Symmetry: D2
Subunit: 241 residues, 4 copies
């Protein structure tokens, strides 16, 4: 039981993640390795450091290195400023240790894609979208059926049912085609508990609203809704001692 | 003068590009390596294959391995269907050989970004955006001024006048932060002629409208090249 | 039927091989990309370029990029100068296109190891050593039994029986442990004809004698004996037109 | 003062090093990642784990992933058994964190070479070889003169006097040609303290005699460190 992470644990966690990134050729600059790159989804998830990121235990903890989050507003017809928040460009590298997760959530605006760079990624998602904001949406290439869950997945203690609605499953390996996760779709993912290396996946998505705004309606905008209330709150800052 | 590329030249060109991409961990699939991946911008540009891709001669030809081109239309409010074309997600690996260029052009809808993976990238662009229509556009962080062209840049014969307005220059190297090329801006880039390796650059941008997720998107070409030759062409590589 | 390779074919062959090398982080400097890096084992093997290195046809052609060939003579007790030629250090990167081979041969002095960097390597070898020079040799870790040949290997036209004595087989993939090929052992290897990429393997071996000598007895020393007489000769220079 | 490393510290240290190695395509196997891969040169060097491997503090500790250590005795003429110990093949990936060192030492038999894969390497060595015995040795291409030490190098406390004779300095960067360290020469190296990544260097050398291919090779230690502390130690990492 701990409510924070020591400065040594935090620096090591991010230094090694950024080294792996740099090793894998991701464009890492110093500003990217900051106090908000290492995410702990909820105070009860700081417990992940009791034994460490190589304990292979299930926790919702991860590091994100963002190299791009472009509003893509310049040159856009002023008439399109109403939906500009559904567009934009974002490129980030995510690092998840064995058995760890990126918890159940959905985005109202952000549509994302995945590219596994190192290791393997198990994605749990809801094939059917939710309805947020506008009731009249477009449709073109609905999410695929995926597969039933594989046997043997260890879910985080005290948050197992938050995964209840993510019934579809797909395992992505390095070299596999990009996997698209449309906006308003519940999803989550982990690095197999038995992986010899951390999971390194590049996320290419639309603008990432995660609190000089491009547009006035963009200020204080939150685009991440977590199923587990606990993870919803903590995602906004990391307690470093 | 060459008017097409032999099947052998084409397959070696793309096989080697796809291997280089896979060597650099870019997710290449069988379908990404097709007869349209290798682009020749204009019939007069097939002459690049007279001496080959390592002749270090100036021509406008390249390889594009597109791993992603997502409309991102699903879940988007119907209210925004009118401007969805300026959105979407595209991820591609571009391979340009020494001395070769991605010809001068601009996109009305697409905004892009570059990530140099291998070698060096010389970007030529206009810091000021063109004015297609006028319809009051938005601004936030306009294009940086850049620097003047260094000396020694050899342009393709018969196309040199098309780079006139692209007065701004930036040189991107492997490991450099992302460079953004806002829509409506004229631009072009090349692999320095003295480079020991081909330029391998990753493009992350909005949807690439090139030959139906949305009715109005049908038959949409979002690439307008300065040179009419490469403009009215580049729709299909001629392979013999 | 051709007895040489055009300058365009040669430059492209080596430029792309060196780019792959550099891509894979091998230390390539300009002096390494020279007129002797692209090897054609015998005049009858120039035919490989009739259709090209992506034709997937069986030919004994390859590129070698040598980054190190250190005599390791400095500091060595003068009393050991007699066997110094069996030692030394060599590091080279080899690139073999789909279906192509590095022909049957053995070394009197050179002991080598293999590290597959990209693609897969099929090694054909003789578990039993030959006797050259000294009759009283040492022994510690004899070559392993390997496996019988797999079905479906296409051998070069007019040289199939030169492979007759290389009865053992082992398939090496990227990430596999180093494979040691002891001196005086017949061996050869190819890149599977169906590989989507060329085979890139790093060779770490003892000094490579392949015609200011470190020692006088080293001058004009040849340490490569090919089964096929044809490949023995050609290996010394490449006919570039 | 620390006297050992916790099992957790050890496993994280090697797990991360092995992942970095695999990320860089180095052939790592389960058996390469063992309780001896992580080396601490001297009991007073366990203090490096007081603040950790990213404290950028000067200590002599590192990770060695040995993919090869071939005696190359097979097929070698019996006549040369006497000097076989100066031969053989060794391939290992060494991972040194910012500010950390591979302590001053020399090998009587081993000659090595370095290939920087990631980060930068600062090598300190004596251009002149030590004289263990005298037995007329051979020469061909002696060690280059090198340059003087740059300013700013922080040495490990209590060991600084052991780097006195290593007056020559060379800085190797990723992609640089191979650097050779002939046997009998004192040397040491570190990862610059301001480095954003750990130093990843590939060692290609003759056989590494460290804790029976040949009778006389039994119990042979070919590493002689200047500092007695790291000398009489380093035979086994103390893990709690
Ligand atoms: O925009 C790009 C490079 O700036 C390319 O994707 C595009 O120009 C290419 O498709 C050529 O038409
Ligand atoms: O020689 C090496 C680095 O110069 C290492 O292999 C060796 O020093 C190491 O085993 C430490 O004893
Ligand atoms: O690259 C240097 C400058 O660019 C030009 O190549 C533009 O054509 C030359 O005018 C030279 O002045
Ligand atoms: O690194 C710079 C030089 O090396 C030293 O650190 C050697 O201890 C200092 O003497 C300084 O003069
Ligand atoms: O808070 C976790 C968020 O979820 C992700 O979209 C993972 O799918 C990341 O990009 C973060 O923005
Ligand atoms: O001539 C091919 C020789 O054979 C090899 O040993 C391949 O086993 C290369 O290193 C070359 O020296
Ligand atoms: Mn998400
Ligand atoms: Mn463009
Ligand atoms: Mn050989
Ligand atoms: Mn040493």
């Amino acid at each position: 039981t701990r409510t924070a992470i020591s400065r040594r644990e935090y620096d090591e966690w991010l230094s090694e993640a950024a080294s792996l990134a740099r090793a894998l050729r991701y464009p890492v600059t110093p500003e990217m390795v900051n106090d908000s790159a290492g995410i702990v989804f909820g105070d009860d998830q700081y417990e992940a450091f009791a034994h460490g990121l190589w304990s292979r235990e299930p926790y919702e903890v991860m590091v994100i290195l963002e190299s791009l989050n472009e509003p893509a507003v310049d040159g856009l017809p002023a008439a399109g400023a109403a939906h500009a928040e559904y567009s934009g460009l974002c490129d980030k590298l995510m690092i998840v240790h064995p058995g760890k997760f990126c918890p159940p959530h959905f985005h109202q605006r952000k549509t994302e894609s995945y590219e596994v760079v190192l290791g393997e990624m198990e994605v749990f998602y809801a094939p059917e979208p939710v309805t947020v904001g506008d009731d009249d949406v477009l449709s073109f290439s609905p999410m695929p059926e995926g597969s039933p869950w594989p046997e043997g997945v260890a879910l985080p203690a005290g948050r197992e049912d938050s995964y209840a609605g993510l019934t579809s499953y797909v395992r992505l390996r390095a070299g596999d085609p990009k996997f698209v996760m449309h906006r308003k779709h519940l999803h989550a993912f982990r690095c197999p508990a038995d992986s010899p290396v951390p999971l390194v996946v590049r996320e290419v998505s639309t603008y990432s609203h995660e609190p000089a705004a491009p547009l006035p309606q963009w200020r204080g905008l939150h685009d991440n809704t977590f199923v587990a209330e606990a993870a919803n709150s903590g995602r906004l800052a990391t307690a470093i001692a």
